[PDB]
Structure 1
Amino acid sequence: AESTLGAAAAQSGRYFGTAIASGKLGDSAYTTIASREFNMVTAENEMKIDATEPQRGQFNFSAGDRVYNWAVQNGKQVRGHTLAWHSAQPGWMQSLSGSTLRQAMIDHINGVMGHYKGKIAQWDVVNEAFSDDGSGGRRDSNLQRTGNDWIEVAFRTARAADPAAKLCYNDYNIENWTWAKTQGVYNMVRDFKQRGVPIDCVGFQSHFNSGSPYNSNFRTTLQNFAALGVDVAITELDIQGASSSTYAAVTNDCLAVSRCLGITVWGVRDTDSWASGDTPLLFNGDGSKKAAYTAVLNALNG
């Protein structure tokens, strides 16, 4: 196949994934589609820090396992999302600073990766660490305020916690090769690779809209990161208005870069999207395929 997105991606060694939401798992229109079309699953909410460690030291894996087991029973692999992040922190973690927050960050990684050890294809270890103010510099968060080495410490922890997982740095607005943010991250991954920090992948959320338009230099971005010796992934793809041509273009960027592992779109139907008003996904509210679906499919069969 040929007929579905994931089977067609697999023709060139790649995956086509989606974001799954444990709450929509009793909707069978939703699971029929999701099961048929994707070979990769990211839990949309259920593996975030507030979802896995809502009380300090007391982890909660129900919602995460529910998504995990659905995926796995339906033939899919899984991306973990996400271990260290400025948002989606619980109350007890937002209150922490300095070394105590550091210890909590390390503890979270160890615990979450521990529970999922050897069962996760990729982990977004660190998420959205860079700023949008145009400086190319780090976002100012409690995590950053523990010291500039937090990202790297997060990565070394995670490598030791689950040596089988691909470790990703994930971020939005790093798709355009000329943006500061792109270059700030580029420079970090370069520095990492040169010094031997265990980072395996970079995750391009690929949330495209009027404020962050697709640029065909996205292919240059993907090429240049790959050339540092990392894989790349399109992790949270959606496109405001769901242009067929933009959807075919992004798909074709991925197919032209051999270290591009695959594409994940951020939800199944437009009604499931965090931006449902923009109808930015491949399926309509009612389950019918959008033009973009056909364009992506053709490209993957391309």
Structure 2
Amino acid sequence: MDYEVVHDTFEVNFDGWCNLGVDTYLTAVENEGNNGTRGMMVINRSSASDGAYSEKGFYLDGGVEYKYSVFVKHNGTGTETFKLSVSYLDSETEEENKEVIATKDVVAGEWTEISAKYKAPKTAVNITLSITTDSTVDFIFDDVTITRKGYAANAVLKDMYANYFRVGSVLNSGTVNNSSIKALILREFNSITCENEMKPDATLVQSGSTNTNIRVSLNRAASILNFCAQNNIAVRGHTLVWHSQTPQWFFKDNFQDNGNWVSQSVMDQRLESYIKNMFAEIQRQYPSLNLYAYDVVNAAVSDDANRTRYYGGAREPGYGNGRSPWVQIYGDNKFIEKAFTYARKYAPANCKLYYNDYNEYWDHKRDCIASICANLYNKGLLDGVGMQSHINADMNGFSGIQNYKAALQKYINIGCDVQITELDISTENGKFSLQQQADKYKAVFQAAVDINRTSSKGKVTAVCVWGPNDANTWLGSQNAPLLFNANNQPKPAYNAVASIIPQSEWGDGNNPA
């Protein structure tokens, strides 16, 4: 058992560990760790199955044997039976099986090692270590260890663009288990956004929320944040307010999907609380994470010209289908400035606040987004406009290079920054070739680089692609819309984008400027 694949020694961050059981609480405390170090306390359990867990899919493969080892300590009376358990999901049967791998009776007051060798089936993905007891006893663990068993800049995006902006991609619960993508991200990208795991419905906790204390959870995001903090990859938060992927109950008097719409002043409380508590938890659990940007409000301007003309861009009130529960409560887009105010209040200083939207180069919508953002920038509330940049491969037309530069320029002319937040470039089911997609990718990065070489005030501080490869895109792979194919081989677009910056100007991707 040579290689060490995991070593969690909670000195800085929670290292990807979550509370098992909706009411269990994890708290990392100084000096309560093994050897006087920082340790991880698990409290408030209410059944032998409650406890703590960590998805380690990033680090553990199916069909491989590992030695799993954790030091634990409890402060009760007599012996406690500790259990280490491993869970996976069978990529065939789609069932979660959890087998207890080590059972060990542990005396009070003493740091003890619990460990065993375990080899999960060849078809196991999402391998998850969890610690529990045979009682509902409180405990503390430290020094989790899993083992087996067998500046010159590189030609990589983050290094090539180190003097210009971060270069981002996206991770999700599924891709976080893909070894091959882990290697890709580490090699190329210095920014990650969670595709879904930081949205309101992935983070809000219904049980026990109240108007002035909305409970939140990073359990869905934790392996990602952990992976990013551990490897010095910056993260964009996505997203605090959005008419989509937000539970209806969040908007209802009794925290139930079918309650009554709440008043504006009730919803102010809940809005502020969600925002305060999201920032508090990120700080609490991943203080070393470079949370460089956050999408405070997402996609609030309507695609409908009638609404941008006569209703300040408000979507239609309601829930689902592009309707907005925010407009349902507030009547209006006034909630936007509210969200940025609370975000300015609780975000770290280095965390830049973005209004993010798509079809951002369509005149009537562009004009409305630019106006909203300029008013916010001027009040000190907003730092940047996010251009989602869900575009196609056509140099001409609705998202062609002209419309796109015009929008990039009008955003930059506000004085704020710009980020290109969710870039993908659809071939429209093969209507456009990979060679034309390469041209559009080259045009877009080239336009960002040009802004940065020109002026001044405004900059493009990130360019991010909405996915790591063509096997993992929300547009479906028939639109092959990213820089790497389904085997992570670089496409023509990658070659193209890698050819814009001369070797002399490359810098340190881990310390971009």
The TM tier, using the shorter chain, reads over 0.9
> Greater helix percent: which structure?
1
Aligned residue number for residue 273 of structure 2: 107
Larger Rg computed on CA atoms: 2
Q: Structure 1 residue 133 and structure 2 residue 304: aligned?
A: yes
CA distances 1:206-256 after superposition (whole Å, capped 9, x unpaired): 001389533323223222222212110000000012510000001111111
Richer in strand (by share)? 2
| Cα distance in 2 between the residues matched to 1:93 and 1:301 | 50
Deviation of 1:197 (Å): 4.1
| Pairing partner for 2:292 from 101, 115, 121 | 121
Partner of 1:199: 382
Say which of 293, 314, 335 aligns to 1:150: 335
Q: The residue matched to 1:116 in structure 2 has which SS?
A: helix
Letter of the 1:206 counterpart: S
2:369 maps to 1:185:
yes
Asked whether 1:218 is paired with 2:404, we answer yes
Other-structure match for 2:347: 162
Q: Does 1:294 align with 2:495?
A: yes
Unmatched runs of 5 consecutive residues or more in structure 1 = none
Question: Within 5 Å, which residues of 2 pair with 1:1-302?
Answer: 1-10=153-162, 12-55=163-206, 56=209, 57-95=214-252, 96-99=261-264, 100-117=266-283, 119-135=290-306, 136=308, 137-140=313-316, 141-145=324-328, 146=330, 147-164=332-349, 165-176=351-362, 179-194=363-378, 196-209=379-392, 213-241=399-427, 243-258=437-452, 259-275=459-475, 276-301=477-502
**2:215 touches 2:277 (CA, 8 Å); kept in 1?**
no
Describe the shift of the 1:106–1:81 C-alpha distance in structure 2 as closer, same or farther (beyond 3 A).
Answer: same
Deviation at 1:13, TM superposition (A): 3.2
Per-residue deviation, 1:51: 0.6
Higher RCO by CA contacts (8 Å cutoff, separation 6 or greater): 1
Moved more, 183-192 or 206-215: 206-215
Q: Take 1:59 and 1:262, find their aligned partners in 2: how far apart are those partners?
A: 28
Q: CA RMSD in A?
A: 1.9
Cα deviation digits, residues 152-188 of structure 1 (max 9, x gap): 0100100111141100000000134xx2010001111
The 2-side partners of 1:215 and 1:13 are apart by: 20
Q: Say if 1:106 and 1:157, in contact at 8 Å, map to a contact too.
A: yes
For 1:22, what is the secondary structure of its paired residue? Answer: coil
What's the CA shift string for 1:13-44, capped at 9, x where partnerless? 31110011132222111111121110000111
Give the Cα separation in 2 of the matches to 1:160 and 1:191. 18
Work out the CA distance in 2 between the residues paired with 1:280 and 1:246.
11
Q: For residue 80 of structure 1, what is the amino acid of its counterpart?
A: G
TM-score by length of 1: 0.92
1:284, distance to aligned residue in structure 2 (A)? 0.6
- CA distance in 2 between counterparts of 1:88 and 1:133 reads 21
Residues of 1 paired with 2:279 and 2:335: CA distance?
17
Greater Cα offset, 264-273 or 20-29:
20-29
Name stretches of at least 5 consecutive residues in structure 2 with no aligned partner.
1-152, 253-260, 317-323, 428-433, 453-458, 504-513
